[PDB]
Amino acid sequence: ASIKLQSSDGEIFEVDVEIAKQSVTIKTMLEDLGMDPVPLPNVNAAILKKVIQWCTHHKDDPPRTDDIPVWDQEFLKVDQGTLFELILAANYLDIKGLLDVTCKTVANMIKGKTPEEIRKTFNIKNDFTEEEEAQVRKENQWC
């Protein structure tokens, strides 16, 4: 009925056995080496809280194509900093649902935006010359 997870900084949380079961990482760990609590060194308390809140809202759901349910919609309305870890945590805890909604939100931040606007708003470099910059744009010409 219940299990305890220990975040990276130490903080301990208590959740339903199956709600945590949504993390393939936590399920893999639970089958062997067992006795609280489950240590998740790669997720701090702040992030783990959000993750547990998320996992709790779903638990059980009947839901198609890429949409980003009405709820998760605003749940991710968090600033860019937290979303970066929130999407990293999903990979770490292996929660299919989360990785999905967080990757789309990041995708939606690329839709209709030029490569320039991408470099900035996403803080990425640009090791492209003008030699390839434009040479690459010639290979994607057929579009």
Partner: protein
């Protein structure tokens, strides 16, 4: 805080939500970003139907690991300038496209893993049909309307595809009785769907005999436009214990009355007999054979990638992720 340094896998995960145009866009953000944008997990299924592009591009795209390539009614009629390595494609449809026989040869020379292919309405060649024979795993092959190949190349192709389930070798105007005789003499006995219609005078009752003798598993047999086929052959159809859908449309010398026999085939579920039912009697035939469905399938579905119930953008049940709107 910064989004770079983000693990590769997770990036692809983000990239996999982008539409072909976007994906190509993020391709020019940072070399790596460009390296991942052309991964392989992202190019599993591609759909460029109706696109007009250069064979080199389509060649380069298939080399990114494409598995299901939907590209019918497209324009690729320039010469191949590049050279490629074996492709991964297992599902492809280039039907009713405008492709130079050489370019077609070029692309097909790199294929050996095709499971479902459709070159419907395309001019082929012996070389082409011969390298096709490399795809000995084909389950569904559509060559309806194709031309330009000897009965020799056809034989070798059929002797290779021994796991053929659906074969649509119809309306190959180029054919002679040589081809038809090769067809029935070399189709795999594992075949369950065969659409050999359109050969009117080159298909004899005998060939029907051969076929039946060699493919006890036919479930779909379409012999539309086979004039030489008159009721005296119906006995053959009884030899097919799994026959479910038969089509004899326009087999003129069939006495309406005689079609009544077919009703006796224990497994027959539908029958197409367009053009041989005098006007004002079809309803009689229908009523006489209440257990059958008569003249309800204007079109064939044998080895057709997309029978589509209006807007089915899938090829053989595969929905492509990459498409241009």
């Amino acid at each position: 805080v910064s989004w770079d340094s983000l693990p590769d896998e997770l990036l692809l995960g983000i990239f996999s939500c982008l539409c072909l145009p976007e994906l190509l866009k993020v391709s020019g953000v940072c070399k790596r970003w460009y390296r991942l944008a052309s991964d392989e997990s992202l190019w599993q299924t591609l759909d460029l139907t109706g696109k007009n592009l250069h064979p080199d591009v389509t060649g380069r795209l298939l080399s990114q690991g494409v598995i299901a390539f939907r590209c019918p009614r497209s324009f690729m009629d320039q010469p191949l300038a590049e050279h490629f390595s074996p492709f991964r494609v297992q599902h492809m449809d280039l039907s009713n496209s405008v492709i130079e026989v050489s370019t077609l040869h070029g692309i097909l020379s790199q294929c050996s893993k095709l499971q479902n292919l459709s070159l419907e309405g395309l001019r082929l060649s012996d070389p082409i049909v011969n390298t096709l024979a490399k795809n000995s795993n084909l389950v569904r092959l559509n060559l309806s309307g194709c031309s330009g190949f000897s009965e020799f190349a056809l034989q070798t192709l059929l002797s290779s595809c021994s796991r053929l389930d659906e074969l649509n070798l119809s309306w190959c105007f180029d054919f002679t009785e040589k081809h038809v005789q090769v067809a029935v003499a070399h189709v795999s006995e594992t075949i369950t769907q065969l659409n050999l219609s359109g050969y009117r005078k080159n298909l004899q009752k005998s060939d029907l005999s051969t076929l039946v003798r060699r493919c006890p598993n036919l479930v779909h047999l379409d012999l539309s436009d086979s004039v030489m086929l008159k009721n005296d052959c119906f006995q053959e159809f009884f030899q097919l214990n799994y026959l479910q859908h038969l089509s004899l449309s326009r087999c003129y010398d069939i006495i309406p009355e005689t079609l009544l026999e077919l009703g006796e085939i224990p497994t027959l579920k539908t029958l197409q007999v367009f053009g041989i039912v005098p006007d004002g009697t079809l309803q009689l035939l229908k009523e006489a054979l209440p257990h059958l469905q008569i003249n309800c399938s204007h079109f064939t579905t044998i080895a057709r990638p997309t029978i589509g119930n209006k807007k089915n953008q899938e090829i053989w049940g595969i929905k492509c992720r990459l498409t241009l709107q």
